[PDB]
């Protein structure tokens, strides 16, 4: 048989590439608005939720957008002054002086600051993280709502989604689907309970890199949402403080009525039913032992409490009432409001979240749960699972676990007799390239780099084909005979009962071996023609 070059082959390899956000018609929609799906029969791929790259790109893209969106906003470096704070409870009435819009005049102002937002230096205080970070007020009239964000692959790449319902996150998938853009991924911020996520279709899904390793957070996806309604019941009045030419500093002031506590309600009915289901499921994935739950260990109020972000107000709700051992009721959780918060900890940056008049309410759907396992030689056959926080990428591993990014690779060199998107991935070689697959190779600075790179890969494949005498045609018979050492297989074995992927795995060792022969054969043919 003789070498034969096929262009537009449905095969791929794992790779790292720049994607781009799309969103739907704000911090995110400053992304270009759009989602086709096609099932891939007979295809099995080894997915990996943990060694993925879309989480490591989603993290950096959240950092980049949060830094970009907070550049034309106020900087509270003039506000780092001594604060005369008295009791108004966890709230302090703080009086201080400022350099007003007329610079040679000083004005005394008042503001209600929470005790978590100030540290002492008596009654003299300063705003927390002034002497380590540069606080930046979150801009009003620009909402920071987590709108759904799709991830569309660039030219020459594709995204495979695993449709197996019981898929835990690692290993083979029963049947997959190539898509352009992922589903709406709300970029939520949480610590111990994943909020507003995607529910599991049929069953509870538990995942870790290795359960016997204890430094590795265990993700648990609920197939049934648990309602959670939470609220800040204080009647705040927002006061504007002018500190410069167009810079305004919004503070709380003069709460009206009772100073009530922010609480976070969960229902004792649906909760502990879902938790008993989780307990039943975690019985099987270990040696038989009693499965039961403990509160969080010591740590930063950022990890010891279920934190999130509701309407720009940062809640820190204790979860000791959830993970401590059954009828209808309510599991009302105390919460602490924090204004100066530094999430995704950047040394030298903070964030003053401005206050809101009236009250707010926070209704969300718990669709997940992050856990960890205590170790030691504790015997007694009971495993103590505590909630775990920090390492923010986990919150986007729960939404990017079905997806995988693959690099499409043409030039599937196979032998034949002659000489001289991804719909057919699982199909055998016997019984379309130009119509469907090949046209999909061209159809800020990040998304410009990925498009220039798409152009380079299209030219670095088209030039190879042109140098192998294949300028205008997709299938070429070539003048290089098929060696016996290149895993010699019969035509029956190859073009029947064997898919393109297994063939790609078969002769991956002979890359840059047939290529040199093709170059020199084309050059020999042309130099014979000219002579």
């Amino acid at each position, epitope marked *: 048989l003789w070498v034969t070059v096929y262009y537009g082959v449905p095969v791929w390899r794992d790779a790292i590439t720049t994607l781009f956000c799309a969103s739907d018609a704000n911090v995110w929609a400053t992304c270009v608005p759009t989602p086709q799906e096609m099932v891939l029969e007979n295809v099995t791929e080894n997915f990996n939720m943990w060694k993925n790259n879309m989480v490591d790109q989603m993290h950096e893209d959240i950092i980049s957008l949060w830094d970009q969106s907070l550049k034309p906003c106020v900087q509270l470096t003039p506000l780092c002054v001594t604060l005369n704070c008295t009791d108004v409870t966890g709230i302090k009435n703080c009086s201080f002086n400022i350099t007003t819009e007329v610079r040679d005049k000083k004005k005394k102002v008042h503001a209600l600051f929470y005790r978590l937002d100030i540290v002492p230096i008596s009654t003299e205080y300063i705003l927390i993280n002034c002497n*380590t970070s540069v606080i930046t007020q979150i801009c009003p009239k620009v909402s920071f709502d987590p709108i759904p964000i799709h991830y569309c692959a660039p030219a020459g790449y594709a995204i495979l989604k695993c449709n197996n319902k019981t898929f835990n996150g690692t290993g083979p998938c029963n049947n997959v689907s190539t898509i352009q853009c992922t589903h709406g991924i709300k970029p939520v911020v949480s610590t111990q309970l994943l909020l507003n996520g995607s529910l599991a279709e049929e069953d509870i899904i538990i995942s870790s890199e290795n359960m016997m390793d204890n*430094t590795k957070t265990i993700i648990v996806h609920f197939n049934e949402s648990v309602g959670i309604e939470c609220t800040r019941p204080n009647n705040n009045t927002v006061e504007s403080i002018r500190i410069g030419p167009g810079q305004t500093f919004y503070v709380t002031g003069e709460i009206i009525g009772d100073i009530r506590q922010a609480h976070c309600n969960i229902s004792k009915g649906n909760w502990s039913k879902t938790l008993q289901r989780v307990k039943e499921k975690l019985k099987k994935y270990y040696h038989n032992k009693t499965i039961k739950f403990e509160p969080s260990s010591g*740590g930063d109020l950022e990890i010891t409490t279920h934190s999130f972000n509701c309407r720009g107000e940062f809640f820190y709700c204790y979860t000791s009432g959830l993970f401590n051992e059954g009828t209808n009721g309510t599991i009302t959780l105390p919460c602490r409001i924090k204004q100066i918060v530094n999430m995704w*900890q950047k040394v030298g940056r903070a964030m003053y979240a401005p206050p809101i008049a009236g009250n707010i309410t926070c209704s969300s759907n718990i669709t997940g749960l992050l856990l960890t396992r205590d*170790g*030691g030689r504790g015997t007694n056959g009971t495993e103590t699972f505590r909630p775990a926080g920090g390492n923010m990428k986990d919150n986007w591993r729960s939404e990017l676990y079905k997806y995988k990014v693959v690099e499409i690779k043409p030039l599937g060199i196979a032998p034949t007799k002659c000489r001289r998107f991804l719909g057919a991935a699982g199909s055998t070689m016997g019984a379309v390239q130009t119509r469907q697959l090949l046209s999909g190779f061209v159809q800020g600075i990040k998304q410009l780099q990925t498009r220039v790179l798409a152009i380079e890969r299209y030219l670095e494949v088209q030039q190879f084909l042109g140098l192998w005498g294949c300028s205008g045609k997709a299938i070429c018979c070539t003048a290089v005979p098929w060696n016996t050492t290149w895993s010699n297989k019969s035509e029956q074995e190859i073009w029947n009962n064997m898919t393109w992927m297994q063939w790609d795995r078969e002769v991956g060792n002979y890359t840059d071996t047939i290529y040199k022969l093709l170059f020199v054969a084309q050059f020999q043919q042309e130099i014979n023609e000219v002579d």
Partner: nanobody
Amino acid sequence: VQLVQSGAELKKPGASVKVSCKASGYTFTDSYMHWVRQAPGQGLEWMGWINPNYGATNYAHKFQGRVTMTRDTSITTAYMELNRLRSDDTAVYYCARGNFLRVDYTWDFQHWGQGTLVT
């Protein structure tokens, strides 16, 4: 990697010790600070690790409730406070940095500090 630990002293029943593992010369934030208990002429034990960027800590089932592991990142010094010590707490105490610090992802404790032999 420089780890400079503190000095030991016999603590009576009901006291509290605060041993330190002052680090220098590396990325302290992206580094676990596991603690290890050496029983006297006997096998070691795993007290607990402390992620220092968030304080997220996990102790052993044996010492769960009796110990607490604070960390300071400004001066890049991790802490370990042990209350309610008894006379059976005779041991040595070291701090090991590993768990993906080295090439392998599994717990591969390389650098160790100076020891602390609180009885």
